[PDB]
Amino acid sequence: MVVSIGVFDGVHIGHQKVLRTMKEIAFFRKDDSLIYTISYPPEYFLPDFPGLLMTVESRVEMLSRYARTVVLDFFRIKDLTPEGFVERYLSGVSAVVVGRDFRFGKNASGNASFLRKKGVEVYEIEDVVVQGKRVSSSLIRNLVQEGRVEEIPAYLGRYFEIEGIVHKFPTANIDRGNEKLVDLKRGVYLVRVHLPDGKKKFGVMNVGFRPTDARNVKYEVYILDFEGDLYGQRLKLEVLKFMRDEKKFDSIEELKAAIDQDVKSARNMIDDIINSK
Ligand SMILES: Cc1cc2nc3[nH]c(=O)[nH]c(=O)c3nc2cc1C
Numbered sequence: 001m002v003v004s005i006g007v008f009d010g011v012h013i014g015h016q017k018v019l020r021t022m023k024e025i026a027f028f029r030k031d032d033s034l035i036y037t038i039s040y041p042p043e044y045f046l047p048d049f050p051g052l053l054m055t056v057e058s059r060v061e062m063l064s065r066y067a068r069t070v071v072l073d074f075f076r077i078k079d080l081t082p083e084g085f086v087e088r089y090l091s092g093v094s095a096v097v098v099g100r101d102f103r104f105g106k107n108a109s110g111n112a113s114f115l116r117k118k119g120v121e122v123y124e125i126e127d128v129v130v131q132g133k134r135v136s137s138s139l140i141r142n143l144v145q146e147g148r149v150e151e152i153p154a155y156l157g158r159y160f161e162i163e164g165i166v167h168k169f170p171t172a173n174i175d176r177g178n179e180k181l182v183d184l185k186r187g188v189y190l191v192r193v194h195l196p197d198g199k200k201k202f203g204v205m206n207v208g209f210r211p212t213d214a215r216n217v218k219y220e221v222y223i224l225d226f227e228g229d230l231y232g233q234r235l236k237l238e239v240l241k242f243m244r245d246e247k248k249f250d251s252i253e254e255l256k257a258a259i260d261q262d263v264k265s266a267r268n269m270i271d272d273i274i275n276s277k
């Protein structure tokens, strides 16, 4: 099979390059296509990891739009020798498509080189470069932490997204799940809210330390022109623009005022977008 192998956290434009190339290679080699997505990169378990751009589930759903997608369980492959990885995951595979410096097996002893020696052809995909920077999940995770959401589409191929369930003064508190995900810079954001039933609304989302565990961040959105409790429902939010830093108000009024100011600003932004016919 022609098999793409990588993490693909975020499925950014560099990943899309790998996947499109795999499909073309599959077409001319007349082989089938398969994407192996490693559940977590090794850095994920280290203390300073910023967090994934999205859950593995969201990721697989996106990868699946390109080809059959199989998750490689980090815990199941980290200890394998290069030999055992090939024997167990690449039997009958004649070609793999991976990014440069791809590594595998315990102590990262496996590489494209080793694969070629086992008769596998390896197509190493060069990184995609955007405005002088190499597109990578790390770069995108850093933009999220710096709240630089308008610059994200040029690297990710779309706006950064926050996703989760509600709950678990009307705002929807988004539970993003139990996976370690990158957090947006604390503050207020203009968001496009994809509700269930296909409706799309705009929202003003606040991101703030709500300690209650420490690097614990809360995501609550005030959806514009929408009532009805989405409590228990799944939401997806495109993070469009950083509006203002988080603030420490001195009691239920200047907050209200600040919020009112956020919505007002949002309304103006939306109206600007609309007028850009
Ligand atoms: C819905 C909403 C809640 C907020 N909570 C907030 N809470 C807080 O302690 N500081 C803030 O700056 C803040 N901003 C908010 C902005 C919005 C739009």
Ligand SMILES: [Mg+2]
Residues within 6 Å of the ligand: 094, 119, 120, 121
């Ligand atoms: Mg061969």
